[PDB]
C-alpha cells in the first residue's frame, strides 16, 4: 500500500558517520510542509464549523380532530411573549404550539429532523408550512422568510499557506492546519467553497485542482487510517532487524541498506557506502510509481531531472551497477531476479 519506491528529489551534503549513529526512517506521513509561504488574509467559513451542523430553530403547532397557518405563527409570538393563551375526558378539540424542537440542513434540499416522515420541502413564501405526521401538528420555522439559507456564513483572520503557483491549506485562529488536500467542491448560495475531509466548509476560490463533492454529503460520513498503522510496525522492524544485523556484525550489505529508505515522501535521510566509510545525507523523498521512470537507459538513475553518476558502480540506498550497466535496484530485482553481488562489507572508526 506504499509507493513501490521513493526516489529522492534534492540531496545535499555527504558527511561521514559510524554505525552507532544509525536511525530508522521516520516512515510517518507528514502533511504538505513545503508551503512555508505564510500570507495573511480574510476567509469565509460556515458559522457553525461543519457542513452537516446548521439549523433554523423551530416550533410545532397542533390542530383539531387540521390546524391553520396564519395563527400558528402568530401563536409562536405569544409562547415567547402578551399572554393570551398561557375522567378520561372528551376530545376537547383545540390548538397548542409546543416548541424547542429544531432541525438540520441536508445539503441538497435542507429540511430534516425527527419529523415522523423523512424530510419535508422548501419554506419560502411558496409554502408557509411543513406538514408532518398525521394532520394535527403542522409548522416548523423560526422566521417566516428564509433567514438561514443564505445568512449563515462568517469572515475571519488567518494565514494562507502556499508554494509558488499551487494554493495551500489554511492556518486557523486556533493554531492548527486544515488542508484542502483531497477535498471537494461545494457551492453554497452562490459562493464557490470547498468541503474538506473534515465537515468544515470554507469558501476558498476554486483551487487550481479539485472535484465536486458528490451527493455523498448527507451524514458527512458515507464514504468515510488503521490498516496503515499495522504495516508501519512490520516494516520499521525490518529496519531494526537489519540495523541489528549491521550493529552486531560491523558488516553491512547493500540489501540491508535499502530497509533504511524512507518509504514515504518527505524530509528524511538517505544512506549509502562507497567503500569502508558509511555516510549520510539529507533528502526530500519523492514517490515512485513504476520502475520505468527511473531506469530508462542502461546505467541511469533519475534524480530529479538528471542521470546520477556511477561512483564505483554503487549509487545510494544499496542500488548498484552490476555485471553489465543495468541499474539494479534492490527492491526491483526482487521481481524474481536472483542477484548475488550485494552481500559483504565492513565498518570502521
Amino acid at each position, epitope marked *: 500500500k506504499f509507493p513501490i519506491y521513493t526516489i529522492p528529489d534534492e540531496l545535499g551534503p555527504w558527511s561521514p558517520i559510524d554505525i552507532h549513529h544509525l536511525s530508522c526512517p521516520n516512515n510517518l506521513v507528514v502533511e504538505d510542509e513545503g508551503c512555508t509561504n505564510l500570507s495573511e*488574509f*480574510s*476567509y*469565509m467559513e460556515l458559522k457553525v464549523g461543519y457542513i452537516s451542523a446548521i439549523k433554523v430553530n423551530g416550533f410545532t403547532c397542533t390542530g383539531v380532530v387540521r390546524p391553520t397557518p396564519d395563527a400558528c405563527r402568530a401563536a409562536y409570538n405569544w409562547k415567547m411573549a402578551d399572554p393570551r393563551y398561557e375522567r378520561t375526558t372528551k376530545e376537547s378539540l383545540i390548538i397548542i404550539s409546543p416548541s424547542v424542537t429544531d432541525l438540520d440542513p441536508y445539503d*441538497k*434540499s*435542507l429540511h430534516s429532523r425527527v419529523f415522523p416522515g423523512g424530510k419535508c420541502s*422548501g419554506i*419560502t*413564501v*411558496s409554502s408557509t408550512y411543513c406538514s408532518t405526521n398525521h394532520d394535527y401538528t403542522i409548522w416548523m420555522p423560526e422566521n417566516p*422568510r*428564509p433567514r438561514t*439559507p*443564505c*445568512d449563515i*456564513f462568517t*469572515n475571519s483572520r488567518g494565514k494562507r499557506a502556499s508554494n509558488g*503557483n499551487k494554493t495551500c491549506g489554511f492556518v486557523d485562529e486556533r493554531g492548527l492546519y486544515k488542508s484542502l488536500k483531497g477535498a471537494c467542491r461545494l*457551492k453554497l*448560495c*452562490g*459562493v*464557490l467553497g470547498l468541503r474538506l475531509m473534515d465537515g468544515t466548509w470554507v*469558501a*476558498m*476560490q*476554486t483551487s*487550481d485542482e479539485t472535484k*465536486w463533492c458528490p451527493p455523498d454529503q448527507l451524514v458527512n460520513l458515507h464514504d468515510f487510517e488503521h490498516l496503515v498503522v499495522e504495516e508501519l510496525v512490520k516494516k520499521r522492524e525490518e529496519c531494526l532487524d537489519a540495523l541489528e544485523s549491521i550493529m552486531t556484525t560491523k558488516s553491512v550489505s547493500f540489501r540491508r541498506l535499502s530497509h533504511l529508505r524512507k518509504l514515504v515522501p518527505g524530509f528524511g535521510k538517505a544512506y549509502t557506502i562507497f567503500n569502508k566509510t558509511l555516510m549520510e545525507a539529507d533528502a526530500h523523498y519523492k514517490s515512485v510509481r513504476t520502475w520505468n521512470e527511473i531506469i530508462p537507459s542502461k546505467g541511469c538513475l533519475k534524480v530529479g531531472g538528471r542521470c546520477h553518476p556511477h561512483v564505483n558502480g554503487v549509487f545510494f540506498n544499496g542500488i548498484i551497477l552490476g555485471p553489465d550497466d543495468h541499474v539494479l535496484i534492490p527492491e526491483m530485482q526482487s521481481s524474481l531476479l536472483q542477484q548475488h553481488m550485494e552481500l559483504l562489507k565492513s565498518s570502521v572508526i
Partner: single-chain antibody, 224 residues
Framework: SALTQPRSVSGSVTISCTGTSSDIGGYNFVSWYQQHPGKAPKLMIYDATKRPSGVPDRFSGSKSGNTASLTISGLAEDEADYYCCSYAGDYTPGVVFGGGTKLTVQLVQSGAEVKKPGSSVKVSCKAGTFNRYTVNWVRQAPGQGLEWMGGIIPIFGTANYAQRFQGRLTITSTSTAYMELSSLRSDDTAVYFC????????????????????WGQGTLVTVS
C-alpha cells in the same frame, strides 16, 4: 451550448431563453439585459417576472421552468440585441448569457489600454448602498455574446472566478474595484465591464445570481 436564443427575431414580438435552470434546491433567477451598440447593457428583468426598480418601460417577464420569455410592448428604438442571464447551482459558479437576438422593427473604469505581449493589464472601477454586494467583471469579445469571468464579495474578502479563466484572473476603502490578468493570449482581446449586486434577502439572493444593476463600462484592451 449554454443557453438558447433565436439569432434574431423580426417585427408584439417575443424572444425565448430555453435553459432556465433551477438548481438542486429550488432557485431560479433569469435576469435579462438589452444591448445597444457600443453601449453597456441595462437591466430590464430580474427574478423572471420583475421589472427594474428605477426606470422601466417595456414591462414583460415570463418563465415556465423550462423556458423564460420576453414580450415587447412597442412595435423602432427597441432595435438591438437581447440577452438573458440566470443562476446555476451545482457545477457552475456564476451566471451565463445568450447568443444574440438581433431584434428588428453610476460607475467608471480604468480606460482604453493596449498590451504587446501576454503580460498584465489592470482595470480600475471607482464608485455605497452598504447592503449585501458582490462586484463582478464581464467580457464581450468583438461582436459576439457576453461572458461572466469572476466576482468578489468585498465584505468577506472572497472572490469567485470562473473555470475558463481560473488562475489567470485575480479579481479584487476608496470606493474602488480592480481586475488583473496573468497572461493575455489574444483570444482574450475583448471589452471589459464592471458590475455588482446589492440585495438583502434570499428571495432574489444567490451570491452572483445575475442581478447586475450597478453597471460599469469601458475597458477595451488590445493584445499583440
Amino acid at each position: 451550448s449554454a443557453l438558447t436564443q433565436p439569432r434574431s427575431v423580426s417585427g408584439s414580438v417575443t424572444i425565448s431563453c430555453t435553459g432556465t435552470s433551477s438548481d438542486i434546491g429550488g432557485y431560479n433567477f433569469v435576469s435579462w439585459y438589452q444591448q445597444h451598440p457600443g453601449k453597456a447593457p441595462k437591466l430590464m428583468i430580474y427574478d423572471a417576472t420583475k421589472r427594474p426598480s428605477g426606470v422601466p418601460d417595456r414591462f414583460s417577464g415570463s418563465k415556465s421552468g423550462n423556458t423564460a420569455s420576453l414580450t415587447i410592448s412597442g412595435l423602432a428604438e427597441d432595435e438591438a440585441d437581447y440577452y438573458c442571464c440566470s443562476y446555476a447551482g451545482d457545477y457552475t459558479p456564476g451566471v451565463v448569457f445568450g447568443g444574440g437576438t438581433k431584434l428588428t422593427v453610476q460607475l467608471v473604469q480604468s480606460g482604453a489600454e493596449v498590451k504587446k505581449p501576454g503580460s498584465s493589464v489592470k482595470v480600475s472601477c471607482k464608485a455605497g448602498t452598504f447592503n449585501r454586494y458582490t462586484v463582478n467583471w464581464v467580457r464581450q469579445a468583438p461582436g459576439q455574446g457576453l461572458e461572466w469571468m469572476g466576482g468578489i464579495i468585498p465584505i468577506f474578502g472572497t472572490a469567485n472566478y470562473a473555470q475558463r479563466f481560473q488562475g489567470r484572473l485575480t479579481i479584487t476603502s476608496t470606493s474602488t474595484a480592480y481586475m488583473e490578468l496573468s497572461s493575455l493570449r489574444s483570444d482574450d482581446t475583448a471589452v471589459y465591464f464592471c458590475a455588482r449586486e446589492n440585495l438583502d434577502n434570499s428571495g432574489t439572493y444567490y451570491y452572483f445570481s445575475g442581478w447586475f444593476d450597478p453597471w460599469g463600462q469601458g475597458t477595451l484592451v488590445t493584445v499583440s
